[PDB]
Protein backbone atom coordinates (compact mmCIF):
# COMPACT_ATOMS: atom_id res chain seq x y z
CA UNK A 1 0.00 0.00 0.00
CA UNK A 2 1.43 3.34 -1.11
CA UNK A 3 0.94 6.82 0.27
CA UNK A 4 1.82 10.07 -1.49
CA UNK A 5 4.51 9.71 -4.13
CA UNK A 6 4.03 5.94 -4.57
CA UNK A 7 5.94 5.35 -1.32
CA UNK A 8 5.05 2.15 0.57
CA UNK A 9 3.69 2.64 4.07
CA UNK A 10 5.78 1.36 6.99
CA UNK A 11 3.83 -1.49 8.56
CA UNK A 12 3.93 -2.88 12.10
CA UNK A 13 6.42 -5.52 10.96
CA UNK A 14 8.77 -2.95 9.40
CA UNK A 15 9.26 -1.43 12.86
CA UNK A 16 11.20 -4.54 13.93
CA UNK A 17 13.04 -5.50 10.72
CA UNK A 18 16.22 -4.11 9.22
CA UNK A 19 19.03 -2.03 10.65
CA UNK A 20 16.46 0.75 11.13
CA UNK A 21 14.15 -1.53 13.14
CA UNK A 22 13.76 -1.47 16.90
CA UNK A 23 16.23 -4.30 17.49
CA UNK A 24 19.21 -2.83 15.63
CA UNK A 25 18.38 0.87 16.03
CA UNK A 26 16.98 1.11 19.57
CA UNK A 27 17.85 -2.01 21.61
CA UNK A 28 21.27 -3.34 20.55
CA UNK A 29 22.50 0.27 20.29
CA UNK A 30 21.28 3.69 21.40
CA UNK A 31 22.17 7.36 21.57
CA UNK A 32 23.52 8.32 24.99
CA UNK A 33 23.90 11.38 27.22
CA UNK A 34 27.07 13.00 28.58
CA UNK A 35 28.76 12.59 25.21
CA UNK A 36 30.33 14.71 22.50
CA UNK A 37 32.27 14.64 19.25
CA UNK A 38 35.08 16.60 17.64
CA UNK A 39 37.90 16.58 15.12
CA UNK A 40 41.10 14.95 16.35
CA UNK A 41 44.59 16.41 16.07
CA UNK A 42 47.90 14.82 16.98
CA UNK A 43 49.30 15.78 20.35
CA UNK A 44 52.83 14.39 20.63
CA UNK A 45 53.45 16.05 23.99
CA UNK A 46 50.73 13.78 25.43
CA UNK A 47 51.37 10.69 27.53
CA UNK A 48 49.97 7.33 26.48
CA UNK A 49 47.24 7.58 29.14
CA UNK A 50 46.33 11.18 28.30
CA UNK A 51 44.26 13.04 25.75
CA UNK A 52 43.41 16.64 25.01
CA UNK A 53 39.83 17.67 25.72
CA UNK A 54 38.70 21.01 24.24
CA UNK A 55 37.68 23.35 27.04
CA UNK A 56 34.11 24.02 25.88
CA UNK A 57 33.51 20.30 25.31
CA UNK A 58 34.77 19.38 28.78
CA UNK A 59 32.68 22.14 30.37
CA UNK A 60 29.49 20.87 28.73
CA UNK A 61 30.32 17.22 29.49
CA UNK A 62 30.98 17.80 33.20
CA UNK A 63 28.31 20.48 33.66
CA UNK A 64 26.61 19.10 36.82
CA UNK A 65 29.97 18.19 38.39
CA UNK A 66 31.19 21.74 37.77
CA UNK A 67 27.97 23.13 39.27
CA UNK A 68 28.32 20.98 42.40
CA UNK A 69 31.97 21.94 42.93
CA UNK A 70 30.98 25.54 42.15
CA UNK A 71 28.47 25.50 45.01
CA UNK A 72 30.86 23.65 47.36
CA UNK A 73 33.27 26.52 46.95
CA UNK A 74 31.40 29.74 47.59
CA UNK A 75 31.51 30.95 43.97
CA UNK A 76 27.80 30.10 43.62
CA UNK A 77 24.98 31.06 45.96
CA UNK A 78 22.64 28.20 45.00
CA UNK A 79 22.50 25.57 42.26
CA UNK A 80 20.46 27.73 39.86
CA UNK A 81 23.09 30.46 40.16
CA UNK A 82 25.81 27.91 39.42
CA UNK A 83 23.84 26.78 36.36
CA UNK A 84 23.55 30.37 35.13
CA UNK A 85 27.29 30.91 35.70
CA UNK A 86 28.28 27.75 33.82
CA UNK A 87 25.95 28.71 30.96
CA UNK A 88 27.38 32.24 30.74
CA UNK A 89 30.96 30.83 30.71
CA UNK A 90 32.01 32.93 33.69
CA UNK A 91 35.76 33.20 34.47
CA UNK A 92 35.46 31.27 37.75
CA UNK A 93 34.37 27.94 36.23
CA UNK A 94 37.68 27.05 34.59
CA UNK A 95 39.69 26.74 37.80
CA UNK A 96 36.82 24.56 39.00
CA UNK A 97 36.69 22.65 35.71
CA UNK A 98 40.28 21.37 35.82
CA UNK A 99 39.58 20.43 39.44
CA UNK A 100 36.66 18.12 38.57
CA UNK A 101 38.51 16.75 35.52
CA UNK A 102 41.45 15.41 37.53
CA UNK A 103 41.67 11.60 37.36
CA UNK A 104 38.16 11.29 35.89
CA UNK A 105 38.66 9.19 32.75
CA UNK A 106 36.83 9.63 29.48
CA UNK A 107 36.23 7.15 26.67
CA UNK A 108 37.41 7.88 23.13
CA UNK A 109 35.87 5.99 20.21
CA UNK A 110 36.44 6.08 16.44
CA UNK A 111 34.00 4.35 14.14
CA UNK A 112 34.16 1.82 12.62
CA UNK A 113 34.84 0.01 15.92
CA UNK A 114 36.44 -3.10 14.46
CA UNK A 115 37.96 -4.50 17.66
CA UNK A 116 37.66 -3.63 21.34
CA UNK A 117 40.70 -1.35 21.03
CA UNK A 118 38.40 0.89 18.97
CA UNK A 119 37.26 2.26 22.34
CA UNK A 120 39.94 3.32 24.81
CA UNK A 121 39.94 5.18 28.11
CA UNK A 122 42.10 8.27 28.56
CA UNK A 123 42.77 10.83 31.20
CA UNK A 124 41.58 14.21 29.89
CA UNK A 125 43.63 17.39 30.13
CA UNK A 126 42.11 20.72 29.16
CA UNK A 127 43.32 21.97 25.79
CA UNK A 128 42.92 25.37 24.18
CA UNK A 129 40.95 25.05 20.96
CA UNK A 130 38.08 22.95 19.68
CA UNK A 131 39.97 19.81 18.60
CA UNK A 132 40.58 16.62 20.54
CA UNK A 133 44.28 15.89 20.97
CA UNK A 134 45.02 12.20 20.42
CA UNK A 135 48.21 10.39 21.40
CA UNK A 136 50.19 9.43 18.26
CA UNK A 137 50.66 5.83 19.51
CA UNK A 138 46.95 4.95 19.69
CA UNK A 139 46.42 5.64 15.97
CA UNK A 140 47.13 2.02 14.99
CA UNK A 141 44.36 0.69 17.23
CA UNK A 142 41.80 3.29 16.11
CA UNK A 143 42.99 3.15 12.48
CA UNK A 144 43.02 6.91 12.98
CA UNK A 145 44.76 9.49 10.82
CA UNK A 146 44.40 13.27 10.69
CA UNK A 147 42.92 13.71 7.21
CA UNK A 148 39.75 15.06 8.83
CA UNK A 149 38.85 12.23 11.19
CA UNK A 150 36.50 12.81 14.12
CA UNK A 151 36.16 10.94 17.41
CA UNK A 152 33.53 10.63 20.11
CA UNK A 153 33.89 11.23 23.85
CA UNK A 154 31.79 9.40 26.45
CA UNK A 155 31.82 10.27 30.14
CA UNK A 156 31.46 7.40 32.64
CA UNK A 157 29.52 8.48 35.72
CA UNK A 158 29.13 5.52 38.08
CA UNK A 159 32.03 4.42 40.26
CA UNK A 160 31.97 1.02 38.54
CA UNK A 161 32.17 2.64 35.10
CA UNK A 162 35.08 4.86 36.15
CA UNK A 163 36.81 1.79 37.58
CA UNK A 164 36.30 -0.16 34.35
CA UNK A 165 37.73 2.78 32.42
CA UNK A 166 40.79 3.16 34.65
CA UNK A 167 41.51 -0.59 34.79
CA UNK A 168 40.06 -2.47 31.81
CA UNK A 169 39.85 0.13 29.05
CA UNK A 170 42.73 2.44 30.00
CA UNK A 171 44.94 3.36 27.06
CA UNK A 172 48.28 2.45 28.69
CA UNK A 173 46.87 -0.93 29.79
CA UNK A 174 46.16 -2.19 26.25
CA UNK A 175 49.42 -2.07 24.28
CA UNK A 176 49.13 -5.44 22.53
CA UNK A 177 46.67 -6.51 19.85
CA UNK A 178 44.04 -8.82 21.40
CA UNK A 179 44.05 -10.72 18.09
CA UNK A 180 47.73 -11.60 17.57
CA UNK A 181 49.50 -10.46 20.75
CA UNK A 182 51.79 -8.25 18.66
CA UNK A 183 52.34 -4.67 19.86
CA UNK A 184 50.03 -2.01 18.46
CA UNK A 185 51.14 0.98 20.56
CA UNK A 186 54.44 0.62 18.64
CA UNK A 187 56.55 3.38 17.05
CA UNK A 188 55.04 4.09 13.63
CA UNK A 189 56.41 5.69 10.45
CA UNK A 190 57.89 9.00 11.65
CA UNK A 191 59.22 7.58 14.92
CA UNK A 192 60.60 4.62 12.98
CA UNK A 193 62.40 6.91 10.50
CA UNK A 194 63.82 8.86 13.43
CA UNK A 195 65.15 5.92 15.43
Amino acid sequence: VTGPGNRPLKSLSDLLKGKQGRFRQNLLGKRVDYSGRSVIVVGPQLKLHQCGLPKLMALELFKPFVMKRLVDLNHAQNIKSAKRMVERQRPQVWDVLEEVIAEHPVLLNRAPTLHRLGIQAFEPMLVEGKAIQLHPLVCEAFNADFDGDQMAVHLPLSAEAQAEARILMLSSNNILSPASGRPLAMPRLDMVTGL
Binding site: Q25, N26, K63, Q77, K80, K83
Partner: protein, 82 residues
Protein backbone atom coordinates in the same frame (compact mmCIF):
# COMPACT_ATOMS: atom_id res chain seq x y z
CA UNK B 1 4.35 11.91 6.25
CA UNK B 2 6.94 12.10 9.01
CA UNK B 3 10.65 12.18 8.16
CA UNK B 4 12.11 8.82 7.21
CA UNK B 5 13.46 8.28 10.75
CA UNK B 6 10.74 8.49 13.39
CA UNK B 7 13.36 8.87 16.14
CA UNK B 8 14.03 12.46 15.00
CA UNK B 9 10.48 13.56 15.89
CA UNK B 10 11.25 15.45 19.10
CA UNK B 11 9.49 14.95 22.38
CA UNK B 12 8.33 18.29 23.80
CA UNK B 13 9.03 17.60 27.48
CA UNK B 14 11.52 19.35 29.76
CA UNK B 15 14.95 17.76 30.19
CA UNK B 16 16.16 16.21 33.49
CA UNK B 17 18.06 19.41 34.23
CA UNK B 18 15.01 21.42 33.17
CA UNK B 19 12.66 19.45 35.45
CA UNK B 20 15.06 19.69 38.40
CA UNK B 21 15.38 23.48 38.50
CA UNK B 22 11.66 23.93 37.73
CA UNK B 23 10.43 21.73 40.60
CA UNK B 24 12.48 23.55 43.26
CA UNK B 25 12.07 27.15 44.46
CA UNK B 26 14.15 30.31 44.38
CA UNK B 27 15.88 32.17 47.22
CA UNK B 28 12.53 33.37 48.62
CA UNK B 29 12.03 29.86 50.05
CA UNK B 30 13.58 31.24 53.26
CA UNK B 31 11.24 34.25 53.28
CA UNK B 32 8.03 32.20 53.44
CA UNK B 33 9.71 29.73 55.83
CA UNK B 34 11.05 31.93 58.66
CA UNK B 35 9.58 35.41 58.16
CA UNK B 36 6.04 34.11 58.13
CA UNK B 37 4.46 32.32 61.10
CA UNK B 38 3.79 28.61 60.71
CA UNK B 39 0.10 29.54 60.76
CA UNK B 40 0.54 31.54 57.54
CA UNK B 41 3.29 29.33 56.10
CA UNK B 42 1.32 26.07 56.27
CA UNK B 43 -1.96 27.62 55.10
CA UNK B 44 -0.48 29.54 52.16
CA UNK B 45 1.69 26.66 50.93
CA UNK B 46 -1.24 24.22 50.79
CA UNK B 47 -3.81 26.61 49.28
CA UNK B 48 -1.69 27.70 46.29
CA UNK B 49 0.57 24.75 45.45
CA UNK B 50 -2.00 22.00 46.03
CA UNK B 51 -5.01 24.12 45.06
CA UNK B 52 -7.24 22.32 47.57
CA UNK B 53 -10.83 23.50 48.02
CA UNK B 54 -11.39 26.13 50.70
CA UNK B 55 -13.07 23.46 52.85
CA UNK B 56 -10.30 20.91 52.25
CA UNK B 57 -7.70 23.29 53.67
CA UNK B 58 -10.25 23.79 56.45
CA UNK B 59 -9.98 20.07 57.21
CA UNK B 60 -6.18 19.72 57.26
CA UNK B 61 -5.59 22.18 60.13
CA UNK B 62 -8.94 21.85 62.00
CA UNK B 63 -9.95 25.45 61.26
CA UNK B 64 -13.07 27.00 59.70
CA UNK B 65 -13.27 29.29 56.66
CA UNK B 66 -12.81 32.24 59.01
CA UNK B 67 -9.30 31.02 59.87
CA UNK B 68 -8.21 29.56 56.52
CA UNK B 69 -9.45 32.40 54.31
CA UNK B 70 -7.91 34.95 56.70
CA UNK B 71 -4.47 33.35 57.08
CA UNK B 72 -4.34 33.27 53.27
CA UNK B 73 -5.33 36.91 52.76
CA UNK B 74 -2.83 38.01 55.43
CA UNK B 75 -0.04 35.64 54.42
CA UNK B 76 -0.10 37.13 50.92
CA UNK B 77 0.25 40.67 52.27
CA UNK B 78 2.95 39.27 54.56
CA UNK B 79 4.81 37.84 51.56
CA UNK B 80 4.18 41.00 49.52
CA UNK B 81 7.09 42.41 51.49
CA UNK B 82 10.60 41.37 50.50
Amino acid sequence: ALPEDYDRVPADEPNPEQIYHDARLGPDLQAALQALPEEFRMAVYYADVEGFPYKEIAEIMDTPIGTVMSRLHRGRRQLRGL
